[PDB]
Amino acid sequence: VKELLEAGVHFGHERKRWNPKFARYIYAERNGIHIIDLQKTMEELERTFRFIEDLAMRGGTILFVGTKKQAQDIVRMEAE
Amino acid sequence: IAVREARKLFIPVIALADTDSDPDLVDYIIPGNDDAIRSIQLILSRAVDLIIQAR
Amino acid sequence: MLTDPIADMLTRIRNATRVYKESTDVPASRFKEEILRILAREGFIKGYERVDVDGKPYLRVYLKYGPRRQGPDPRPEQVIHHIRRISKPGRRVYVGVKEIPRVRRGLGIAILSTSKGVLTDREARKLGVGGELICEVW
Amino acid sequence: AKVKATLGEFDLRDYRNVEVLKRFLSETGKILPRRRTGLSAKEQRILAKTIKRARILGLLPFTEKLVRK
Amino acid sequence: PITKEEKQKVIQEFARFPGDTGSTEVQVALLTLRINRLSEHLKVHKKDHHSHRGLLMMVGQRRRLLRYLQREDPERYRALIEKLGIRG
Amino acid sequence: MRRYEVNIVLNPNLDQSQLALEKEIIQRALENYGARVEKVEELGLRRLAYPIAKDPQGYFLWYQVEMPEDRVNDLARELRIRDNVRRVMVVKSQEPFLANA
RNA sequence: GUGGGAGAGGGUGGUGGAAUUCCCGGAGUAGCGGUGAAAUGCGCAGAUACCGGGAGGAACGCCGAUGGCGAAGGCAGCCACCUGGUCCACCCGUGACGCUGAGGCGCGAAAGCGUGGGGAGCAAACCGGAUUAGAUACCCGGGUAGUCCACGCCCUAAACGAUGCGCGCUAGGUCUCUGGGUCUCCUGGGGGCCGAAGCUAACGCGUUAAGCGCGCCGCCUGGGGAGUACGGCCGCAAGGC
């Protein structure tokens, strides 16, 4: 944490869109919005970063696929 | 479509999934935000930095 | 009206195990407990616990799945592929020692309520007793 | 606007409260639907029953004529 | 309509013990009272086929409870049947 | 015994003599049928939305009464015998369901 | 059991308005009516359109809903009475008293029959006109049975959700009707719409299953012949099983 919380990572969608299979990650519901348990985010993030670093050091290629509106620029800049 | 294509060819999947997603289709998952430019920025910057450093 | 409890328990286990849920709740009884203990000892379920739901005694069954699969449909392989009820109310099935069936060449099991308790087919043949044929599981 | 909105507190079951019940009728002596009134199903039902009762008493018109084309 | 007072008198009359409202005797007595009222009503109103279904359901329920009571405790069954004047 | 409301719409073209006469007649019939009045409201004359008995006016009488249910019907058929009474409405006393709370 | 709720659920008495028809009164003239176009028809014995006073029969305009109630068939002007089912809360009483149910008993749209009444409008059959190789039909003007009420029969249907009943288990989202609560919203019941798993030949169904199971009942075994013939039972008959 201490970076995730300020970045608004732990903000989900309303109760009108949540996929039931995602329920294992949700901490609690506030003011009609779904909040993600940042702790589980921490362990999962550690796991995924470990995998990413291992694959990169092995020389593997990772493809970035984000085609939303706002995500275009960030994806381009990061991938380049 | 991308995720289904990656599944079909036995390619690992990493996603920045949020509340309205199915975690099963993703092998390595980051439960966080997909809106909120700041969240995307943090996650992607960290990942790219880790890529660069561990080369 | 609930006519068969044991079929109910088996169906509860099945329906649960297929939406890949983690635990399940079933009303408690001695006979159900015997069947559950046989299932657990055979490495079919993670194990059973005695709990209380609003005072009512219930049994919580913890369920076992395989490793996560690769490619499309990555849902883990089932440990209980198929679980039936042989002897139902309105048609009771009893077998001698000679008539004890073999399930999937021994890869599966069949549970009997022999005169010496609830036993798998293997133990019942070893002891040399028969009785009601409850269920087949593999 | 909506008739309920352009009103204060009142009692629907009063079958003699003419000065308000006159508002829930069109130019022709017909009960206004929930589109024009803006009431719940229950309120609308009670209102229709009350209007019918008042019409029986002769307080309200069964039918009228609009002075137009 | 069956008044609160009549219901209460029946309950207090057929109670197994003071403060009982659920014993077989109480239920059978209440059913008997309902059956009586509905029976006379249907005697007057002949073409009321809808209430006849209610009557049949009531009679069936009473018979089921009486069967249970007779199976369990015969003395109470005979006492109740004589007290209420059923089947006679 | 239950609680009821009684509405009488009678001839407007009755003077004091006939008005008090008919009032006494209906009242006498009221205690005849075991009724028990809690309050009386007179609304004088109000304009009807359509003619009743060839006249556009009517005199309104309102009585919140209390009487056994079984007689109520009979009571109504008694209040309608007078030629001067145009409308009789007996309504079980409902509850003030307050709209727009 | 106690405290409450909703509703075109049923039966029996009454009374409210707007039409249609007929009778009469006031005037008031030359056509009304009808069709794709026209006639048949009504009118000069005063038709039609207007106003006023009567009689009578049947159905309830707005509300009105993709809504509610009932086991179905079905049920809506308003008021009162006598009653059936159902839901919620309190978990207060009894102690497995339960589910299904071949026969039996009862209810069962419309049409049809019997004994009486009633008859405004519509209208099988029937009588004319028109369209037409022919219309014995569709369109038009009349018109009995019938449609309405009481009692008694008949017992059928695309009587449909083309889906028997009871119970338990298995993601959700959304729109409504109706209750209780601490009322941002949680918690029961009912009616719909998308859709997880799963099912299905497919269409599609999917917590109101056509999913996973259990208990009981009823049916099916190629299409015609044929719901026919025969025998039986039920009906006044048509006819039904």
UniProtKB/Swiss-Prot annotation, chain A:
GO terms for cellular component: cytosolic small ribosomal subunit. GO terms for biological process: translation. Keywords: Coiled coil, Ribonucleoprotein, Ribosomal protein, RNA-binding, rRNA-binding. One of its GO terms (molecular function) is rRNA binding. Belongs to the universal ribosomal protein uS2 family. Spans the head-body hinge region of the 30S subunit. Is loosely associated with the 30S subunit. This is Small ribosomal subunit protein uS2. It comes from Thermus thermophilus (strain ATCC 27634 / DSM 579 / HB8). The chain holds residues 7 to 86 of 256 of the full protein.
Swiss-Prot record, chain C:
One of its GO terms (biological process) is translation. Signal peptide: none annotated. PROSITE patterns: RIBOSOMAL_S8. The keyword Metal-binding does not apply. Keywords: Ribonucleoprotein, Ribosomal protein, RNA-binding, rRNA-binding. SUPFAM superfamilies: Ribosomal protein S8 (SSF56047). The keyword Kinase does not apply. GO terms for molecular function: rRNA binding; structural constituent of ribosome. InterPro entries: Ribosomal_uS8, Ribosomal_uS8_CS, Ribosomal_uS8_sf. One of its GO terms (cellular component) is ribonucleoprotein complex. It comes from the Bacteria. One of the primary rRNA binding proteins, it binds directly to 16S rRNA where it helps nucleate assembly of the platform of the 30S subunit central domain. The combined cluster of proteins S8, S12 and S17 appears to hold together the shoulder and platform of the 30S subunit. Part of the 30S ribosomal subunit. Contacts proteins S2, S5 and S12. Belongs to the universal ribosomal protein uS8 family. This is Small ribosomal subunit protein uS8.
Curated annotation (Swiss-Prot), chain D:
It comes from the Bacteria. GO terms for biological process: translation. The keyword Heme does not apply. One of its GO terms (molecular function) is structural constituent of ribosome. The keyword Transmembrane does not apply. Keywords: Ribonucleoprotein, Ribosomal protein, RNA-binding, rRNA-binding. GO terms for cellular component: ribonucleoprotein complex; ribosome. Belongs to the bacterial ribosomal protein bS18 family. Located on the back of the platform of the 30S subunit where it stabilizes the close packing of several RNA helices of the 16S rRNA. Forms part of the Shine-Dalgarno cleft in the 70S ribosome, where it probably interacts with the Shine-Dalgarno helix. Part of the 30S ribosomal subunit. Forms a tight heterodimer with protein bS6, also interacts with protein uS11. Binds to the C-terminus of IF3 and to the central section of Era. This is Small ribosomal subunit protein bS18. It comes from Thermus thermophilus (strain ATCC 27634 / DSM 579 / HB8).
UniProtKB/Swiss-Prot annotation, chain F:
One of its GO terms (molecular function) is structural constituent of ribosome. The keyword Iron-sulfur does not apply. GO terms for cellular component: cytoplasm; ribonucleoprotein complex; ribosome. CDD domains: bS6. One of its GO terms (biological process) is translation. InterPro entries: Ribosomal_bS6, Ribosomal_bS6_CS, Ribosomal_bS6_sf, Ribosomal_S6_plastid/chlpt, Transl_elong_EF1B/ribsomal_bS6. Keywords: Ribonucleoprotein, Ribosomal protein, RNA-binding, rRNA-binding. Belongs to the bacterial ribosomal protein bS6 family. Part of the 30S ribosomal subunit. Forms a tight heterodimer with protein bS18. May make transient contacts with protein uL2 of the 50S subunit during translation. Located on the outer edge of the platform on the body of the 30S subunit. NCBIfam families: S6 (TIGR00166). This is Small ribosomal subunit protein bS6.
